[PDB]
């Protein structure tokens, strides 16, 4: 028994709720929150900017030190950094950005990173401003992640579409 509340159960291990990921993290303080990162860990917009803003830019400061030491992530890759005031840890995961021409087949590789963590609060990867179809991202999530994932979908209209079209 964990502390996530109000989620709709999609499968054995995948749950979904119409929620702002920042407001969710602040309320639950999960072990792992997933960031929709880019390879440079430049948190300007979407999940990344909202989480980063909620950390008063501490996420960006930590991220810039990480990149200066390690160089960029791979598309499909991840790193574990601090969760600051939002979570114990933040798993920064790079899904492909369709709006930049990256291979959508890398979305499965991106979701595989979730399997290294027993429980995660996470957004749908590669959707929103990354330009891929959210219905597809949810399907890949369900078909790839085996650990317990709590998906926060910001847009109420999209949430209803995702639930109603879920197979
Ligand atoms: O932008 C995205 C990804 S795309 C999407 N996911 N659900 N609807 N659209 C966000 C996901 N969670 C968020 N929380 C706060 C803010 Br600000 C933005 C998002």
Swiss-Prot record:
UniProt-annotated location(s): Host endoplasmic reticulum membrane
Domain called Macro: residue spans: 1-167
Topological type in the membrane: Multi-pass membrane protein
Stated regulation of activity: Inhibited in vitro by GRL-0617.
Self-association and partners: May form homohexamers. Interacts with N protein.
Stated role: Responsible for the cleavages located at the N-terminus of the replicase polyprotein. Participates together with nsp4 in the assembly of virally-induced cytoplasmic double-membrane vesicles necessary for viral replication. Antagonizes innate immune induction of type I interferon by blocking the phosphorylation, dimerization and subsequent nuclear translocation of host IRF3. Also prevents host NF-kappa-B signaling. In addition, PL-PRO possesses a deubiquitinating/deISGylating activity and processes both 'Lys-48'- and 'Lys-63'-linked polyubiquitin chains from cellular substrates.
Descriptive protein name: Papain-like protease nsp3
